Amino acid sequence: ALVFFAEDAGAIIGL
Amino acid sequence: ALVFFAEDAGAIIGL
Amino acid sequence: ALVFFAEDAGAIIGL
Amino acid sequence: ALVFFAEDAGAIIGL
């Protein structure tokens, strides 16, 4: 599984 | 919807 | 890239 | 945060 980051403030973190 | 970035090397883009 | 589904109603779709 | 499922075979879980 990869770590994905979005910005929305702070980081939205997808595992 | 958000733009997500991972890396694995280079970037991996998520929508 | 994988298609990810969550439920929140309808499907939240991650590309 | 949501629970996401993909498949690739078997399930791939995202948080």
Ligand code: MET
């Ligand atoms: C697994 O790879 C997962 N963290 C991907 C982002 S959350 C759908």
Ligand code: MET
């Ligand atoms: C929509 O925002 C999509 N790019 C990400 C859904 S959360 C896994």
Ligand code: MET
């Ligand atoms: C790429 O694999 C992408 N669709 C994963 C879910 S959105 C972060």
Ligand code: MET
């Ligand atoms: C939080 O909801 C996390 N499991 C998914 C973030 S959107 C890629």
